[PDB]
Amino acid sequence: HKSEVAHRFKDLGEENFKALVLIAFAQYLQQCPFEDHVKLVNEVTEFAKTCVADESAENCDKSLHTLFGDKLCTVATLRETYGEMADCCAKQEPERNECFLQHKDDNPNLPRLVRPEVDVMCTAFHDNEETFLKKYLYEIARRHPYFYAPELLFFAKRYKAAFTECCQAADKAACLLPKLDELRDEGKASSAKQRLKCASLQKFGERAFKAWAVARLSQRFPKAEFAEVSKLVTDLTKVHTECCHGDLLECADDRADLAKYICENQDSISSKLKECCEKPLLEKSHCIAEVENDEMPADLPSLAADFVESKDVCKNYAEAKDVFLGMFLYEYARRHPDYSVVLLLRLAKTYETTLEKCCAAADPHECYAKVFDEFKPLVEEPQNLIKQNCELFEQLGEYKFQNALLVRYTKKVPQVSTPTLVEVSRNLGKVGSKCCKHPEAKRMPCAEDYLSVVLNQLCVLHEKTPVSDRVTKCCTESLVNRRPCFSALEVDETYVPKEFNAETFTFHADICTLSEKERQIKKQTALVELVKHKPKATKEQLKAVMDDFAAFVEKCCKADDKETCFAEEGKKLVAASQAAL
Numbered sequence: 001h002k003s004e005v006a007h008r009f010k011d012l013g014e015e016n017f018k019a020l021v022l023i024a025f026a027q028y029l030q031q032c033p034f035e036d037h038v039k040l041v042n043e044v045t046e047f048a049k050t051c052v053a054d055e056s057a058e059n060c061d062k063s064l065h066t067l068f069g070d071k072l073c074t075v076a077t078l079r080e081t082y083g084e085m086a087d088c089c090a091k092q093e094p095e096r097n098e099c100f101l102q103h104k105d106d107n108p109n110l111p112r113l114v115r116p117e118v119d120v121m122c123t124a125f126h127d128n129e130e131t132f133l134k135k136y137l138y139e140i141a142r143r144h145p146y147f148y149a150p151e152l153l154f155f156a157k158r159y160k161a162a163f164t165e166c167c168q169a170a171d172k173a174a175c176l177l178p179k180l181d182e183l184r185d186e187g188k189a190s191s192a193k194q195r196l197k198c199a200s201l202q203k204f205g206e207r208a209f210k211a212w213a214v215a216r217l218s219q220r221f222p223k224a225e226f227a228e229v230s231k232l233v234t235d236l237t238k239v240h241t242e243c244c245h246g247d248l249l250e251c252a253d254d255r256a257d258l259a260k261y262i263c264e265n266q267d268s269i270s271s272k273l274k275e276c277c278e279k280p281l282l283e284k285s286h287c288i289a290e291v292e293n294d295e296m297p298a299d300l301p302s303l304a305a306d307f308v309e310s311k312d313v314c315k316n317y318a319e320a321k322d323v324f325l326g327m328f329l330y331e332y333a334r335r336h337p338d339y340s341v342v343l344l345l346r347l348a349k350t351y352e353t354t355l356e357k358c359c360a361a362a363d364p365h366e367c368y369a370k371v372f373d374e375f376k377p378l379v380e381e382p383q384n385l386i387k388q389n390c391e392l393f394e395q396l397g398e399y400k401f402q403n404a405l406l407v408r409y410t411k412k413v414p415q416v417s418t419p420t421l422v423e424v425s426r427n428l429g430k431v432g433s434k435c436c437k438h439p440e441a442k443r444m445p446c447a448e449d450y451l452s453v454v455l456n457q458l459c460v461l462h463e464k465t466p467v468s469d470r471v472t473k474c475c476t477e478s479l480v481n482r483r484p485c486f487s488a489l490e491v492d493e494t495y496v497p498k499e500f501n502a503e504t505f506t507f508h509a510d511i512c513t514l515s516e517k518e519r520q521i522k523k524q525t526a527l528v529e530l531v532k533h534k535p536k537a538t539k540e541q542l543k544a545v546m547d548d549f550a551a552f553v554e555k556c557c558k559a560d561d562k563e564t565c566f567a568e569e570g571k572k573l574v575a576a577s578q579a580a581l
């Protein structure tokens with residue numbers, strides 16, 4: 001291991017090496033032009049090949065942090081452009097690297113990347129495929145400087161595949177656009193999870209993180225024994241703690257180490273791990289992190305033996321409370337992959353609460369019996385919600401299902417901005433489409449995955465621009481009570497109806513040309529504004545108003561003249577509607 005850079009180049013391969021180096025530099029120097037970074041990438045790459053030919057080369061023996069930091073400090077416009085960051089160059093390793101980490105800018109001021117015309121895109125992709133993909137990789141990287149590089153590289157390769165298909169199919173846009181949208185969604189969903197995962201570690205501490213980890217690791221690896229799960233959870237915590245810190249190389253090494261260990265003890269962890277461990281170093285950790293749940297042992301007893309009916313229960317628990325609780329959590333989770341992780345956490349927490357209560361009683365054995373009865377109401381809470389909502393999603397379209405939620409959440413929290421209500425409602429709708437297609441056995445984990453990001457996304461926007469105490473109570477409580485807290489929201493009896501505005505309910509003929517997506521958005525925007533103006537409207541009354549509107553649109557988008565119909569019958573619709581409500 002004379003040369004760190006030489007070893008990295010051999011493991012990743014020139015192409016991946018280049019791509020990752022571009023991402024790294026793009027994540028630090030986020031305000032330097034693309035051609036600058038390209039020059040860097042080629043300089044580092046050529047040097048690396050020098051080191052590959054001969055590890056004893058002149059600078060080959062240096063550290064990757066040292067080499068990276070030196071390159072950063074050779075940027076001529078560094079001080080001018082980045083000010084303080086240029087001061088880091090006086091610090092010495094390893095203090096320097098930390099200094100660079102400190103002055104990494106999160107979400108700087110840049111204009112939103114606008115998706116160009118399909119013809120233009122495919123044409124660029126054909127003429128210069130490499131400078132086309134890398135330019136966009138650079139653009140994504142600079143705007144998401146804390147996103148894990150190998151993960152950003154993982155999406156890049158998927159983008160490249162998308163164009164390869166569609167850019168030579170007659171109806172390109174019909175192919176490409178629904179693929180780019182999927183990527184956009186997944187990319188931001190992945191990014192959200194990461195910030196969230198890291199934020200929770202900081203917010204609630206290592207313990208809660210370990211509890212979360214124990215549940216999911218037990219679910220995924222139900223054939224694994226607790227001692228093994230403990231070591232994995234222990235290491236996973238170590239990894240998340242370092243990765244959350246932000247050092248790419250340190251984070252990468254810890255990840256690689258865990259994947260290394262997991263793949264070598266495959267037989268002792270999971271049977272569905274063979275293909276993941278076969279993949280290259282770069283993809284190992286990724287693969288393991290979302291591997292399929294292993295199938296659990298047929299001969300599995302009930303927990304009641306070791307956790308309820310047994311003697312030595314307070315003694316075993318008091319001897320190591322968190323260990324014993326983790327065992328309960330492990331034992332329970334591996335039997336129920338059909339549960340959300342947070343559900344298992346409510347149960348383990350419930351088990352904990354009673355032991356703290358009953359072990360202090362004269363005879364604990366009775367208060368244990370109470371425990372499992374308490375589990376059932378907590379378990380059915382999320383189960384019922386899923387049944388009903390997926391039924392609702394079945395009867396009504398995804399669009400009409402979104403509108404159902406729309407009215408519901410507008411009446412629960414009317415103070416929220418209209419655009420926010422429309423967005424969260426459309427997204428919860430999408431969750432319905434994706435999860436309700438699963439059977440019950442897999443529905444709850446599915447919902448938890450999407451609601452987690454949607455609910456924390458929701459809480460982030462509220463952080464910046466608070467609008468309700470009840471929403472801030474939900475956003476700032478335990479991430480296990482979060483979703484139930486939102487579900488506990490009732491209709492706001494406080495809300496004063498917002499004053500009428502004819503403009504808000506004034507529609508022109510342009511909506512007849514609008515795309516299917518934003519005709520809906522404009523309609524849904526008005527639906528929120530309707531519910532806000534008269535929040536005490538019944539479902540029948542609201543349906544009536546919406547029906548008249550719907551026919552009103554089809555009557556004006558069907559006429560020889562249009563803009564007059566929208567202004568004349570529009571006047572009629574608004575008047576009649578104000579009267580009914």
Ligand SMILES: CCCCCCCCCCCCCCCC(=O)O
Nearest residue numbers: 208210211230322323325326348349
């Ligand atoms: C391998 C051992 C890991 C430790 C297991 C800890 C189990 C804790 C049980 C209660 C759920 C923890 C949820 C955190 C929320 C809280 O701080 O109350």
Ligand SMILES: CCCCCCCCCCCCCCCC(=O)O
Nearest residue numbers: 020021024067068252255256282285
């Ligand atoms: C002089 C070096 C310049 C900087 C080098 C950029 C960082 C390249 C290392 C990234 C490799 C990631 C390792 C695999 C990822 C994983 O297993 O999780």
Ligand SMILES: CCCCCCCCCCCCCCCC(=O)O
Nearest residue numbers: 409413416420458461462471486487
């Ligand atoms: C910035 C403020 C945003 C507030 C958004 C108000 C709408 C809340 C949506 C709650 C989603 C959680 C769904 C749980 C299932 C349920 O409805 O009971």
